[PDB]
Design a protein around this ligand. Sequence first.
Ligand SMILES: [Zn+2]
Ligand SMILES: [Zn+2]
Lengths: 431, 399
Amino acid sequence: GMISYLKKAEKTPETATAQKVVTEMLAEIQARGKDAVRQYAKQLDGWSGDIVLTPDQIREQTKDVPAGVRADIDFAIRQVTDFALAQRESLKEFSVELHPGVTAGQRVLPVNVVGCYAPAGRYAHIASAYMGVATAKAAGVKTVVACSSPFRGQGIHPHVLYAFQAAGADVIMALGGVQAIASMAYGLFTGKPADVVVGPGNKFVAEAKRSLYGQVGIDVFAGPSEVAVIADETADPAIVASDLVGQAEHGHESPAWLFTTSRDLADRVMALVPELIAKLPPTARDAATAAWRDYGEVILCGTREEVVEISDRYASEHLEVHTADLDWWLANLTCYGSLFLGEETTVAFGDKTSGPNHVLPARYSGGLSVHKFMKTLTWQQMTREATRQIGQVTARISRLEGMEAHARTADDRMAKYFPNASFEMGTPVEV
Amino acid sequence: MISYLKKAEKTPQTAQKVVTEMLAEIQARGKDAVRQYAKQLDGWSGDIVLTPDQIREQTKDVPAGVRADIDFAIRQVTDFALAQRESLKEFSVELHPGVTAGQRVLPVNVVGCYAPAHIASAYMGVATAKAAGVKTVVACSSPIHPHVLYAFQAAGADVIMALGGVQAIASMAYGLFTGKPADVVVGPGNKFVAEAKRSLYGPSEVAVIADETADPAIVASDLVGQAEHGHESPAWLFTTSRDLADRVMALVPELIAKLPPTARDAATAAWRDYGEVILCGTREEVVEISDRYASEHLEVHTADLDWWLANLTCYGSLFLGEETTVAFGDKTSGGLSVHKFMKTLTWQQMTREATRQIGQVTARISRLEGMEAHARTADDRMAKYFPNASFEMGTPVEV
Ligand SMILES: [Zn+2]
Ligand SMILES: [Zn+2]
């Protein structure tokens, strides 16, 4: 019954002045198209060079990326690709017979164009650059357009650019912020408007994606990196603490949660975390100090079932499980971004997918995966014979609804397909 | 090679802020506050949650012939939804040796359905959610048209509530009366209901593709069919045949004129203001157009139906061939399907051996990104699993 907070969030988790800026910028971009984008690039980034990169510029600007660094990025990207490919196979097409003579089915096809944004900020994961691109390509999307702002006057940060290329981007553009999102959405420079745009950004990028796409633009986890660990008495406190500190270095708002049934484990982690932080270099130390302090939580529960309940409520983007009987946890947890089962894997090793935007005040729906880039289209087809029954039912129900024209769609078919037969087609609507 | 033989004459012209007040009251006061708004908006001072007896009583007047019709209609949605559910598969896969990953597929716990009209608008949400395996479906309808109430029950609603508007949506969302907050609420609603759902989790088209083999009488009747809904119902004809386009453009007014008053009025306005007839040179141009307009309901009256099924890429629901038609009913809405009510959860697990490579790749990438704490999670596993190892884990971050 009694859940026990050994450590509480000492601060609670947003002005929408982004709304004005985006409205204004989109208005301008709708008006002047490429020239407004190019001018925004100049005013905001000081950029005067080419927007669309050529295959030669790509090779040139990545030439100084060493083989060891390239092989590591290649490896990381392949982990994503291999999972996305398997996931693509998990949504099947089918046909099914319903009422005899009725056939219906689902087609599954990738969207035509996906735009991928990489903010390439100072403290960014390279995975932010390749995850969208790799996933879209593995979904079968035919055109992936990738944007990242110029790094230091030369062009796109070379690692981000290498990642874009290695992940299979079809077009790469040196563009940042709202004007990148808008250029992708409207198909500026390529003539290929994006069916969806993905990629983490500041509140302006978020707001442009919302404005242009609605819910499908804001249904991916955004905001400070999270980590949660479920642990029982078998868990190693030194590993649990390390993992929490791992994402706490992201910045002062990064939440780090431990859910446990072991008082002993909770106690040791709570003591270990500050010690681990103190041994980080300055930027990380200061970042994690604040993050652990204001957003770090430790929750001791009596039973496994209560852990599940609170974990499902918190719905961490990244959820590690360090327990005996891992099968039970996979079977019983229901809300999270992605699950890391067992001690061996860990959050830093990387996501296969990105979870939904669970911190939205729809919380379970969306995320970055192949499913985001797939359409399911439904169809039906009937023999004449099938309509004998369905025509009747439609006419009658229709006339009960007062939908006289609907009914005649059925009358006309009944007349045409069964000329020498009469049917109870309902009493016509006079009103 | 594309010409509009009939264009749309206008676009929809242009409030729902009270929500905040109703909601703020409901939040602070709960059931009481909702009960308040029941008498005040619907003249209801009975119980909200109906009991099985009430449901049987209030639907006892509904004849067995009508019930059979509705049950059948529901089955044609249910049976499709059951197949569609099985199209999203759980799986496990081995990536890099010793890396296992997978996908669970889980129905949500609770769905709320609002029915404010086609009876289909009442049963589509409920039947879809039940076919998806949702264990609790709450259905609301402002006080209840016996057909709507019969539809809820026959479709498999678990709780039915005589409740309307924002009260209904907020009730289901907060889970007042039942104690079961909906993971999502669905239904057709007014702008108040629209803003209510838009706060809490935030006209019927018809298009016909026709070639020279199409019967223009049937094509006209079908366009007329959905025009009769309101004055804002769009009815689009995409065609490669001027002959059909003219004969349709000719017969539509004559069909409208023969409809009873309300429908005549509705369909006149709609056909005038929103009707479009677009002639194209090639099948490829029709596809280009159809996909741009992405009609919610798209009929195809052509030779070579397989080609259109293969090439059309944007629509809500395809009606393939002449025999079926929009009035027969959707299987899904473009949207509402079983997929809307199911979660995908992804997981990974690794052997120690897998981390030998994955951990050192991670440590090196992490340190290049300036992410020292990240790198240390890899270091710590390497030390635990491979104690005497000396792999390249990258230079520690000093900054
Ligand atoms: Zn991280
Ligand atoms: Zn209709």
